Amino acid sequence: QAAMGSQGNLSAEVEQATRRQVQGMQSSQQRNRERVLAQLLGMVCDVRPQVHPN
Amino acid sequence: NYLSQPRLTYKTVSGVNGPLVILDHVKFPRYAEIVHLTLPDGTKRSGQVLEVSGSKAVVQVFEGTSGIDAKKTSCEFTGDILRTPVSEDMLGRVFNGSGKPIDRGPVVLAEDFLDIMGQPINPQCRIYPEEMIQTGISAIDGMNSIARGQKIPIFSAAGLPHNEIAAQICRQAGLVKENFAIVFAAMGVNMETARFFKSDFEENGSMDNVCLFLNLANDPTIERIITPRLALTTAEFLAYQCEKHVLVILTDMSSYAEALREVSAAREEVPGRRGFPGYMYTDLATIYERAGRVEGRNGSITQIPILTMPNDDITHPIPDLTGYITEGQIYVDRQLHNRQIYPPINVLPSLSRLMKSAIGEGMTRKDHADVSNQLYACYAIGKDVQAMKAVVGEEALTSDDLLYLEFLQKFERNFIAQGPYENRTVYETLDIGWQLLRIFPKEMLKRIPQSTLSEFYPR
Amino acid sequence: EKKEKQIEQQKKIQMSNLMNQARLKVLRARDDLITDLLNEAKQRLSKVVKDTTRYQVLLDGLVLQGLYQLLEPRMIVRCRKQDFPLVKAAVQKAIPVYKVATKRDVDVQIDQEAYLPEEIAGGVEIYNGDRKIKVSNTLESRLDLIAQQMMPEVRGALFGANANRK
Amino acid sequence: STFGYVHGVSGPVVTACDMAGAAMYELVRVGHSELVGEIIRLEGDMATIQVYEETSGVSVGDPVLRTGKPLSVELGPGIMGAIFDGIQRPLSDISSQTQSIYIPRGVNVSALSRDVKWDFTPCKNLRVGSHITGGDIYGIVNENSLIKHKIMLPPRNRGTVTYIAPPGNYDTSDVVLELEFEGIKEKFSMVQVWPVRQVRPVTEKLPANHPLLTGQRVLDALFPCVQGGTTAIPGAFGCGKTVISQSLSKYSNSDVIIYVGCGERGNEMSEVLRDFPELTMEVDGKVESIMKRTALVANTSNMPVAAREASIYTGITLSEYFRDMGYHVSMMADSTSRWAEALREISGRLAEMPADSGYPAYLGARLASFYERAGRVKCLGNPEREGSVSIVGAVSPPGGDFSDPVTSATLGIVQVFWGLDKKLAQRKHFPSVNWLISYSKYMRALDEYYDKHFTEFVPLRTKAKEILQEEEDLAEIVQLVGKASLAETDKITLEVAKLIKDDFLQQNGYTPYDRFCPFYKTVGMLSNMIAFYDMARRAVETTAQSDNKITWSIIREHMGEILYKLSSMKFKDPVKDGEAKIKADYAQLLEDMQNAF
């Protein structure tokens, strides 16, 4: 009986809690993807050359 | 804010002897700089710059100089010091000694980059540890009680069960009557030692907060230097920058200093005692004094570093220098291990310097400060009496000293010997301790005044 | 007490191994969300390479950035095959500004024997005279440097910030 | 030239090129963050600099600007109750200016706050036009209710007063005095800048006569210290080298106290600043905490190693500064062995050749030039006051072995030696001072004080040190031959000495009665344990062989109430002062009559 309740502890979360955490951050990735790429791509084009300070 | 200049790559090595590579024609080298070596076969090695002189820079690679060419190797100068990627999701995982994941995992996403050398805490804003940690062991909780934010080592030897009592105080760490995030540095350990700690943390279900850093004996010795440095800068992050109580376990600290001797002897630095470097006290204190608690934060960090003294010598440079920095030690002995006591803890060279502020009326109760001194004094006299009955005879002693014989066989078997999973409370420990003082008369308990003898000795 | 305590331990190992694989799956899922973000950034820098006016004004400073960081008498510019007339204007524009800030004088050339590979998006790699010291200033080498320093910022701005700080 | 360029950096040391007009032991500021360093060796154009901060990230192109002045401290108000690091930056102000918990290792924080206002008052008998020399008081500032910070002239200069400030509130930057000396006029403020490696000038040295009352019984009786003397406390870890240090900084007779943590623990300086603002003491019938006379120089073991040299010289300059006001300063250095480990690590970078066990050959000259800045000595100046500096320096020998190049070099310099034993700490016998190997050299210097106030104590310690050595000469017989074969004059020796080691020598530091023991209680309870030894002598020697006599077995069963009185003399709190002297004689009248019966 303990080996049967332990298989009840498997699929209960590993498909419920794990999968909702992926799609929970997949939505959060899509909302903020374009503002990050606007800032990140700008820094590559911001080249400025000093020489050592020495 | 951010280094945005492209890193330079030099193919200009000029000397390599031992673990040191000497790079020439470097333009403005930097002390403590981290570099990346590209071998002529393509394997990548990291290295710290330990000396710069004009255009020359002496680096030391972490994985050794075996195979480093003169014409074909290329070293790339990362423009900053060695900073590790630290995060909150840097918890619940197992990492190697250098920086990398082990359990088929990703690299950490780096909430910030912290320097692994850290920086020392201002003593004006460092609050003194007061609250007591109940570890469930009577030799720990009763006589040498630790506080939350206390540095206290386990003084052990080869073969003694120091790993078994290391896992015991991790399962049973709690406040005296919201869990401890344990960061674990495994340094120079056997494979069966790393499998013991992995299968213990994966057994009690604490592995959602364990930060285990493992560094086996086959891994190189120069990576043992940065192994407690990375294991303490995540604990600094979790406690001073994430508001969480951290327990750091360092093992083996003898494998740290033996790896520290190899690098010092290769750099031809000045030796101290037994070949160890003269700056060994400073290097041991830059990983020991990164502990305690600060005033503005509610998290803390406590350190229990395990070290095995060579040849059972407490005057060796390993336990002597760690005894001068830390706040009292725990001495697991060998002669008590032969008698099958599971914590073989000789309480006479054991100490806890912060135990006085952690005991009292508000902390546990009134008689804790008094029964611990009396159990210490009767064990000290009865062990000197034990060296007298072995040289003269078991019958010709003073009549009071036969009670000292009866105390010691009840002290080592009932008070300290408790079993691998039994977790006594502090009130259980003092109740067992008064049972062993019951066999002595009331007026031979000299270290206890007459006031609290009335409330506890008739029972 | 052997039949019961072993299966209670083995289930508790089994339960703890389940949370390990559940934590490692969602952590590996966070990798590919950053990996394609670096992959689509590699595509969108190639579109900057396609148009010319924004790419050359990038390439004027990007050649000069390797020039000011090397500071040798003789330096060697090594470029892509397609961008070779574009870097030739970029090197010639970067000569009389090197003489303004610094007071040596450079002696640049452009290596026609060896070029950068075709899979390389853009940028340049500038060597010294002796082939020994090298500054790699390509677009794959410039994207990697900014992506390292911004992993604090592309996690908090792109996922949820941690509720426990300082 | 004005500034320099780094050539190489390897650990704490920095080689700096383009540095030609630089003198030895000048102060420089190396790097972009301006790390404070000191020149120790120069080879033509290049100078070598030991840096008091961490050199991590210092590049070759970094500038090294020269200051033209040695390492010095600012001396004035705002120094009692403060806490500094080795180069005298205030730790309480460095944590409010930055709001962090770390020291940013770049900050040039002023040592004394230039915004806090102090109420200056003049010498009253210092008019305009009066002649004035170096080192005399020209004003009084009450920094606390306990400390009157006497403002003094620097010892270099002299002149005629042309302007003096009226009584009021002033900063540390306000001009207070103007002196015309040749017909040149130099301004003065309430602060003066003195180099730490230079001994303060002073009129003439004096012999030391008054003792330092530490409060412990074994320290005040057997191995006494004077104010103006040098003391060394060696010992292994866990022996109690800080409990002697904390009980001396709490309960001594000293006017001001400084405490130099040189390579100490970080928690041990936080331990000091907690219980010090609640421990009040009584000087004029008023109660004030002992933090108002305390000043800390905190350089923990996490902090850089070259600042251990600077924290020692910072303290002894502050110790010699309050010496010149007429106060009796006591300095505790903990530990001086970490200063010796600092000199080893610096000289290892310069490739110097080592003396015994790694340490440089100039180790014993650094220690001698530090302990010889202590002494009771008449200060410079016209009001003709007298001050003193006591140095009590903890030594940490490796392995607890006193055959050490730091310990053995120290014992040739100091006069008092409090040897802490580990076997006396393996049993809970505190304080752990080993009475056999410890000594003092102020014996002949103190008995002129002892035939005035306690006229009976010098014959007492001559017998009490004889009894403790008689026990040690017979303790080797008992472990080899046995206790059953002794004489009767020896069994009385072992039990009285066991009464001395348990009542007189043992002292609980946290109990409310033995945390401080005044000297009448020390001479009092020692006068009864030796008279009991002399009374039990006559019970054995006079009735020697003939009669069925007192054989000491009948003593221990009949004096069980009287021995319980002798073992309980330590329980006399300072709630009684006159009654404790009576009960010392009330226990003696029981001792008087019981030998008759």
Next chain:
Amino acid sequence: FYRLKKIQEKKKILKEKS
């Protein structure tokens, strides 16, 4: 051993310049 090896290291320094 440390003193004698340090002398030999300094003896190669003066030999290399001279």
